[PDB]
């Protein structure tokens, strides 16, 4: 019944390859989001300039 | 007729070396199966990554 011990090791592996990964589709998003942040930044200038001029 | 007692001991040995082994071809299987479990595990990553990316 080391087999159990085995099947234990199996069992603990059994419920070890499921739901043990939080928030990574969450995390990639941030950067994937933040990528979008990277772009309109330059627009701020003429926006300011417009506000600056006007 | 200790011979009987003997042949008894024979007899009980007679039907003792047959069908007294359950489920071990069943058991090896599990690990033999579980061996197969051990492998595709790594595939889960890019699978996730694919799901993660996409």
User: Given B34, B41, B52, which is nearest A24 (Cβ)?
Assistant: B52
The residue to which tokens 């890019």 are assigned: B46
> In this structure, what are the phi and psi dihedrals at residue A43, rounded to the nearest 5 degrees?
-60, -30
Q: CB distance B30–A24 less than 8 Å?
A: no
For residue B48, give both structure tokens: 């996730």
> Closest chain B residue to A11 measured between Cα atoms?
B34
For A9-36, give the DSSP string: HHHHHHTTSSS---SHHHHHHHHHHHHH
Packing angle, helices B44-53 and A24-40, rounded to 10: 40
Tell me if A28 sits within 8 A of B53, measured CB to CB: yes
Experimental method: cryo-EM
Q: Is B19 helix (H, G, I), strand (E, B) or coil?
A: coil
C-alpha angle with apex A45: A43 to A48, nearest 5 degrees?
115
User: Among the residues of B1-54, which ranges form H helices?
Assistant: 2-14, 24-40, 44-53
B31 contact residues in A (CB cutoff 8 A): 6, 10
Tell me if A17 sits within 8 A of B41, measured CB to CB: yes
């Amino acid at each position: 019944f080391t087999l159990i011990e085995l099947m234990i090791v199996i069992a603990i592996v059994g419920i070890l390859a499921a739901v043990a990964l939080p928030a990574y589709q969450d995390y990639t998003a941030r950067a994937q989001v933040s990528e979008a942040i990277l772009l309109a930044e330059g627009q701020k200038s003429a926006v300011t300039e417009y506000y600056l001029n006007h």
